[PDB]
Amino acid sequence: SFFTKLTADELWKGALAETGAGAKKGRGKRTKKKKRKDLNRGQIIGEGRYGFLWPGLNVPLMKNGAVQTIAQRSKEEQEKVEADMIQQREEWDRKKKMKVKRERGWSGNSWGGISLGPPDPGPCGETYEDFDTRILEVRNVFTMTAKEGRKKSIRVLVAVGNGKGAAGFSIGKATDRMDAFRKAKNRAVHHLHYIERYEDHTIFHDISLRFKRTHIKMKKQPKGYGLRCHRAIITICRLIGIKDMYAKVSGSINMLSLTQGLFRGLSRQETHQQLADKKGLHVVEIREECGPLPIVVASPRGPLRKDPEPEDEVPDVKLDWEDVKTAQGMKRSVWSNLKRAAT
Amino acid sequence: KNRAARVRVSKGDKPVTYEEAHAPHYIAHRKGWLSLHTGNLDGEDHAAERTVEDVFLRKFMWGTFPGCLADQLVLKRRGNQLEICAVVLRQLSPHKYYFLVGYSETLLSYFYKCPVRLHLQTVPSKVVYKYL
């Protein structure tokens, strides 16, 4: 009857079943979720099936300076309004269904390598338009509770960089994935590192550190070598601005230890000026391309030492078998020096 | 736990009105009544006929002013007269409001054989009491 009729809000609230026991603990499949539709969007007050034209409501009150009278559309004319209304509905529905093209990361369904944009602007006139955010890891962590039981939480690792030596990472934890992206992104700009770059394209020297159980052996390379490193390192290096470098990860491939160890070793690298000041000597660069010419890249600001460093017949420096095995043509691997895309 | 006429708490982005923010145990302490007639007084009659008229009026005005009602109706009866008081949004043009006022007043006077008067109070946006 007419007294057993509810409102749209009550009908959709019960039809969607958004708030229910099933939603609470992963008890409902999302393959075919029901979707709310507004059935009043394209409705005009005064338009009915009979095709009546109400002056002042459906149609203009006055025509040619005189008040109109009650009129009713003809069958042919009213049938053309229903079909044109349908086309509007289909057009609206079609546009919503269409999906805008997206840019994938490392994998199609992987969050890693996806950009989150610049961090949110600060209240006190602070902006980070020159920074870029890139996701490294999105984990779904669970915790047993007394009442709810097994509740789902999101842990997100992101890195931010301006491309000119400034970069940082952070962790975001929340129940919604969109809230974890904001926290990590906005908190990474308050924990920024400054990475020194040799000629603005690579590190000053070969780095070989170990964070906990993760081993990272980076190498300095010339221009045009490109980035031949772990995909996560390639994301961070672009953020820092390192064009050319080689890196190998051994041990545990934990993203957080690989991220916390990379920023640690790239911040503790000695430049050529520091080396000169520390030893009061000239740092001379020798290149095969330039032959025997000595290129002075740094000189001490203080008193230049008059005595040379004592030559060492043999140096007691720990070597790496992986590097010695490669130079002597003994490291056979069908996965090294493979043709890949530009990084 | 009790559910009747209660808006459950949310993250904080849900705006509720004064009438919608109070439960039934405040109906005579912090809230009034949306309808005022004599049917329910001691020794009065026709309480079942005034109630059906109220239920129909709220649905008639809700579908006759779609999307324009900010708050619930306040129905008033004084003798023969019936006064409908409503708060409405300013989205709709005045020409359409005057039309619906002259159409609704007249139709409801011939349906309930009584002089019906409708008093609109436009507001820019739905008055917000607090955010639950």
Partner: peptide
Amino acid sequence: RHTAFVIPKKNVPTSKR
């Protein structure tokens, strides 16, 4: 098919003291 995820429009705080 991959899961379709796009950045949602940021909300504006509604409740101010």
